[PDB]
Amino acid sequence: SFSKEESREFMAIFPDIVRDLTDHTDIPEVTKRFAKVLQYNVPTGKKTRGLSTVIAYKMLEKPENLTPENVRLAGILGWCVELLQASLLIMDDLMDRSETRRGQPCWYRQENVGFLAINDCLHVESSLYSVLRKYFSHLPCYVPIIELFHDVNFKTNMGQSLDALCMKDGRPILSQFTMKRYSSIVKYKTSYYTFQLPVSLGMYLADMYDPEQHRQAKTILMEIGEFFQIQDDFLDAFGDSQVTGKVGTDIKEGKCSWLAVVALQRSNPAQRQIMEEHYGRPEPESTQIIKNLYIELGLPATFAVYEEESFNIIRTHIHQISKGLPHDLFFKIMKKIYKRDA
Amino acid sequence: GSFSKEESREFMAIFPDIVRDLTDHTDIPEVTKRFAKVLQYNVPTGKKTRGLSTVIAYKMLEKPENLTPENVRLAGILGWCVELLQASLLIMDDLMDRSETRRGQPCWYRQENVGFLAINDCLHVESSLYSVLRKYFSHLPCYVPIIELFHDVNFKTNMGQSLDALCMKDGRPILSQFTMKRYSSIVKYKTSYYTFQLPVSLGMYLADMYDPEQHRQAKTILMEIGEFFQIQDDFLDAFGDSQVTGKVGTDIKEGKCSWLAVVALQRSNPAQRQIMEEHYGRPEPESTQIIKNLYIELGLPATFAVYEEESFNIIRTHIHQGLPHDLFFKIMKKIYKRDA
Numbered sequence: 001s002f003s004k005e006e007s008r009e010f011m012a013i014f015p016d017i018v019r020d021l022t023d024h025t026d027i028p029e030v031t032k033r034f035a036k037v038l039q040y041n042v043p044t045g046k047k048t049r050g051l052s053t054v055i056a057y058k059m060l061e062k063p064e065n066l067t068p069e070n071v072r073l074a075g076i077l078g079w080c081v082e083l084l085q086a087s088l089l090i091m092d093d094l095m096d097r098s099e100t101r102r103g104q105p106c107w108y109r110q111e112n113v114g115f116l117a118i119n120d121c122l123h124v125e126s127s128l129y130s131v132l133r134k135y136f137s138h139l140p141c142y143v144p145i146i147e148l149f150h151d152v153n154f155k156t157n158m159g160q161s162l163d164a165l166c167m168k169d170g171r172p173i174l175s176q177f178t179m180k181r182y183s184s185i186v187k188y189k190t191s192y193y194t195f196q197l198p199v200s201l202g203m204y205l206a207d208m209y210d211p212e213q214h215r216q217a218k219t220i221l222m223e224i225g226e227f228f229q230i231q232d233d234f235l236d237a238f239g240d241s242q243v244t245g246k247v248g249t250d251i252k253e254g255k256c257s258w259l260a261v262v263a264l265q266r267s268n269p270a271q272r273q274i275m276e277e278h279y280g281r282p283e284p285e286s287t288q289i290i291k292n293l294y295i296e297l298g299l300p301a302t303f304a305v306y307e308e309e310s311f312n313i314i315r316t317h318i319h320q321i322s323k324g325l326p327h328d329l330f331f332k333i334m335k336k337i338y339k340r341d342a
Numbered sequence: 343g344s345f346s347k348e349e350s351r352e353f354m355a356i357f358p359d360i361v362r363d364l365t366d367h368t369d370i371p372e373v374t375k376r377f378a379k380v381l382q383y384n385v386p387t388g389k390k391t392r393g394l395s396t397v398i399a400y401k402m403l404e405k406p407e408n409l410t411p412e413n414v415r416l417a418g419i420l421g422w423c424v425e426l427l428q429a430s431l432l433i434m435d436d437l438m439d440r441s442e443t444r445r446g447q448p449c450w451y452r453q454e455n456v457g458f459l460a461i462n463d464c465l466h467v468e469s470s471l472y473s474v475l476r477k478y479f480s481h482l483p484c485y486v487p488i489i490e491l492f493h494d495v496n497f498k499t500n501m502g503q504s505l506d507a508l509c510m511k512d513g514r515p516i517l518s519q520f521t522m523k524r525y526s527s528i529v530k531y532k533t534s535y536y537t538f539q540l541p542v543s544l545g546m547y548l549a550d551m552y553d554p555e556q557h558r559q560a561k562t563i564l565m566e567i568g569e570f571f572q573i574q575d576d577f578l579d580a581f582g583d584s585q586v587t588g589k590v591g592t593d594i595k596e597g598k599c600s601w602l603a604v605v606a607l608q609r610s611n612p613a614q615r616q617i618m619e620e621h622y623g624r625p626e627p628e629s630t631q632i633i634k635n636l637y638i639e640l641g642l643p644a645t646f647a648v649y650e651e652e653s654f655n656i657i658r659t660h661i662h663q664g665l666p667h668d669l670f671f672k673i674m675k676k677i678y679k680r681d682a
């Protein structure tokens with residue numbers, strides 16, 4: 001349901017994650033510093049992935065099996081996803097040369113961090129397998145959960161690589177900016193870790209190992225992932241940095257974003273040359289010239305129309321879900337993200 | 343095993359399968375073909391001591407009658423999982439230490455159209471070893487312990503790296519904290535766990551040796567060999583031939599808490615100590631050459647050569663004291679007097 005009481009239930013676990021990873025008695029300098037890394041980077045987001053892990057479980061598990069112990073375990077799995085999100089955001093902000101994350105200067109920009117952000121990134125990722133070891137190592141779901149986290153990370157790395165290959169020799173490859181390429185990027189970059197991981201982690205905690213059941217969840221959770229990333233791409237250019245918590249860099253970094261794809265689809269020959277000349281430039285005047293074209297092409301209105309159609313199209317596909325999977329779970333995910341401004 | 347040609351041929355024959363197993367996700371050939379390039383350029387170009395050690399350890403810890411071609415090749419695949427971890431750590435390290443060359447070629451992040459994308463490749467190469475472990479070990483009792491060992495050693499290595507990186511604050515090195523105590527802590531976490539304990543511990547788990555005391559006996563002697571090994575690397579950074587070592591040292595420029603910088607301060611007169619304060623951890627080429635000229639004036643090359651001989655003999659005395667001694671003698675014989 002994504003309610004005040006669940007947000008308070010979830011934030012109550014976080015102190016214990018910090019204690020489990022920091023409280024290696026011969027290097028207190030580093031354990032104390034890693035508490036700061038966790039405190040800064042892990043808990044200040046919307047925590048949708050982590051809260052979806054708990055909601056997924058509660059709606060897949062048999063009502064009679066929903067003990068306070070079993071709910072807490074779903075809470076700890078959640079925070080393991082947020083640990084992965086944290087690691088990915090530390091790296092992403094370095095690679096995309098971002099200014100602000102979640103309302104604060106990006107970790108790598110801070111006084112004595114810089115490239116040390118690369119090590120923190122890797123440290124925050126490996127720390128979740130330590131949390132998994134302490135709480136799940138005596139449960140049937142231990143190996144499958146470990147393997148899902150390894151597979152999802154590998155797939156997320158490939159997403160991030162395909163995302164980075166938008167530029168060669170300082171200029172974007174606008175000829176290759178297709179909706180086919182776009183769909184491949186968000187599938188691997190976003191959908192696997194953001195949407196599949198929480199729901200699958202819910203299924204494994206409930207002992208739901210049926211391959212066809214996971215396959216039915218995957219198909220709709222990929223559609224939701226695409227829908228989600230298109231929202232992120234819109235906000236990067238037209239969002240309020242005060243509300244979103246970040247300054248957009250998609251245009252400056254010359255990303256194959258949903259905006260850039262649709263811009264090219266609808267551009268006249270003079271508008272295409274603008275894109276050629278000014279897309280993916282370090283100059284502020286170029287970024288504004290591109291945003292001005294985006295405005296000119298009615299991409300705000302175009303996004304808003306798509307969002308509403310896509311919401312309805314996805315809902316129709318959720319009503320057709322089979323293999324005894326709960327519909328409401330997927331309606332509840334869509335309700336939480338539909339028309340978001342952060 | 344004895345680090346022989348045939349053992350390098352046996353170990354290099356598995357590598358094509360590792361690249362096949364990770365790259366041959368059919369809807370994105372652009373990324374899988376690029377990752378085959380990332381692997382080819384970053385994994386097998388080292389000496390491969392860690393990976394070859396993992397095979398040698400197993401051969402010497404497993405019962406002679408249980409050494410099948412199947413079991414030896416599994417120890418090899420474990421060897422490559424160690425070389426994948428190494429490959430990922432080196433990509434990250436070169437970005438952080440602002441290094442020019444690695445293994446005779448430009449550092450990965452300096453290559454045309456890499457840059458900060460080297461941060462993704464770093465992460466991507468580490469996660470790829472857990473895909474290899476899954477395929478070949480998921481049915482064995484040693485699966486979970488081997489998964490966990492890697493996770494633990496990675497976490498430990500990350501903490502090593504951080505301590506190493508806190509040598510500087512506000513552009514100046516913290517020379518008053520450059521002790522042998524701090525140094526022994528850096529190398530323990532940064533080098534010894536993944537370079538020496540990991541191969542041997544993997545060879546034990548594949549031989550179904552789960553006795554904690556046996557892992558604790560091996561650990562004690564392998565921690566000594568790691569400290570020895572890192573001191574050798576610290577000497578080469580400043581006095582090594584870059585054409586031979588394959589890398590241009592940056593320890594003086596980055597103001598690292600290296601053995602050389604620790605011993606320099608221990609023996610420095612008050613004029614020599616101010617030279618360090620003024621010129622250590624400076625980007626300017628003239629500052630790096632002044633420090634190397636001070637290092638030569640404190641007879642540090644002769645100091646290292648004496649230490650290397652002493653420690654080599656002291657460790658051999660510790661090895662003599664049901665684990666196979668020749669394993670630890672053969673590792674020490676490989677790295678003793680090395681110039682790369």
Ligand SMILES: C=C(C)CCOP(=O)(O)OP(=O)(O)O
Binds near residue numbers: 045102190194229
């Ligand atoms: C996949 C993307 C777009 C990264 C950010 O995800 P969120 O927008 O959910 O970020 P937080 O709330 O966790 O900061």
Ligand SMILES: C=C(C)CCOP(=O)(O)OP(=O)(O)O
Binds near residue numbers: 088096190
């Ligand atoms: C792997 C991640 C973080 C998802 C997409 O990255 P983006 O770069 O598009 O994410 P934001 O910085 O816009 O949150």
Ligand SMILES: C=C(C)CCOP(=O)(O)OP(=O)(O)O
Binds near residue numbers: 387389390
């Ligand atoms: C921990 C250190 C000093 C990294 C280099 O190790 P090696 O000198 O074994 O590197 P390669 O053989 O793999 O190049």
Ligand SMILES: C=C(C)CCOP(=O)(O)OP(=O)(O)O
Binds near residue numbers: 432435533
């Ligand atoms: C690679 C790791 C984690 C060890 C760090 O040692 P260095 O930073 O000195 O590595 P080299 O360049 O000397 O190989």
Ligand SMILES: [Mn+2]
Binds near residue numbers: 093
């Ligand atoms: Mn970004």
Ligand SMILES: [Mn+2]
Binds near residue numbers: 092
């Ligand atoms: Mn990005």
Ligand SMILES: [Mn+2]
Binds near residue numbers: 232233236
């Ligand atoms: Mn974005």
Ligand SMILES: [Mn+2]
Binds near residue numbers: 435506
């Ligand atoms: Mn280093």
Ligand SMILES: [Mn+2]
Binds near residue numbers: 439
């Ligand atoms: Mn280095």
Ligand SMILES: [Mn+2]
Binds near residue numbers: 575576579
């Ligand atoms: Mn070195």
